[PDB]
């Protein structure tokens, strides 16, 4: 009946572990009663997790707040975060992010490390956007675990991001990658233009690509394949569920635009919906741990790969 907030501080500890060993179990612990949950990472007052669950206050004290303090609090005792060396060392970067993301709230002093704070509920009504976002985060949570558990065993997080990013542009755009690779290049170029050593980092990337041309092109051909097929299976599962789970989100977003409840996140229908959904992908990858820099590199490599595969035809 409303959205409740939790703050889990975990400054220098392994975040991918708190997710899998503390937070996910707590979520299963009340998943018959409150199936509607999701978490986010954020920087403010120290690297932490934001937990959102939506039920009543009476489900709160009965089955959801306890499963958090027991199972999450249980992780905190068992593998507690060391601590950061100096909070203030991050202040100027945090000042700049707060201007950029418009954040609001203290930047200093940090919240106590390894503590759990119940933060109460989101104000009163959420925008149409925030409601769509929340649904998206919830629906994609098992895609998080799957990705992280593959990470915990040494799979390359960038390689997961490569697959997801490519799959969304192929499946959920109108013309597929031949047309959509442009939006993959555009993203990376936006970053490079921001860096005063852009042209030097480009060829570092255009070079790193060509040393590995055959590996990238033939995975992109393969990711696109698991993205289109038209079957009850393929040979890369996690791409298939990504697409299948985003198509509703695309449709619901195009509907929402057509009728007039968005345009922040022929064209503003289809094309607005694509941009919302590729943006939701990027927002997922940040939830997986990907750094903006890694994200831009992955998009840049997708667009190099696409340009090869779809140019040679």
């Amino acid at each position: 009946e409303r959205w409740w907030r939790f703050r889990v501080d975990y400054h220098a500890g392994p975040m991918d572990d708190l997710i899998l060993d503390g937070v996910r179990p707590a979520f299963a612990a009340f998943a018959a009663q409150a199936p509607m949950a999701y978490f986010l990472r954020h920087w403010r007052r120290g690297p932490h997790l934001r937990i959102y669950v939506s039920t009543t206050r009476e489900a709160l004290e009965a089955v959801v707040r306890p499963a958090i303090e027991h199972v999450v609090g249980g992780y905190l005792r068992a593998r507690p975060s060391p601590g950061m060396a100096d909070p203030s060392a991050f202040l100027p970067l945090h000042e700049r992010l707060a201007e950029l993301e418009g954040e609001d709230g203290p930047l200093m002093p940090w919240s106590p490390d390894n503590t759990i704070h119940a933060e109460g509920e989101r104000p009163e009504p959420l925008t149409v956007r925030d409601v769509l976002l929340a649904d998206f985060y919830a629906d994609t949570t098992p895609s998080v675990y799957h990705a992280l558990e593959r990470v915990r065993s040494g799979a390359s997080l960038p390689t997961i991001a490569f697959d997801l990013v490519v799959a969304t542009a192929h499946a959920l755009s109108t013309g597929g990658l031949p047309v959509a690779r442009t939006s993959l290049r555009s993203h990376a170029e936006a970053y490079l233009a921001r860096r005063s050593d852009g042209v030097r980092l480009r060829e570092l990337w255009r070079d790193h690509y060509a040393r590995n041309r055959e590996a990238f092109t033939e995975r992109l051909i393969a990711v696109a394949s698991s993205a289109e097929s038209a079957e009850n299976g393929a040979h890369l599962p996690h791409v298939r569920e990504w697409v299948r789970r985003l198509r509703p989100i695309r449709e619901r977003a195009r509907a929402l635009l057509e009728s007039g409840e968005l345009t922040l996140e022929r064209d503003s229908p289809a094309f607005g919906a694509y941009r919302l959904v590729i943006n939701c992908t990027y927002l997922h990858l940040t939830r997986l741990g990907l750094t903006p820099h890694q994200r831009f590199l992955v998009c840049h490599l997708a667009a190099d790969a696409a340009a090869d595969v779809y140019g040679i035809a």
């Binding site: 799979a155 390359s156 960038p158 390689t159 490569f162 570092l204 990337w205 790193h208 040393r211 590995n212 590996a215 990238f216 995975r219 890694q294 590199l297 490599l301």
Partner: peptide, 8 residues
């Protein structure tokens, strides 16, 4: 399998 992600 996984892609090479070393730049320099």
């Amino acid at each position: 399998n996984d892609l090479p992600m070393d730049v320099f």
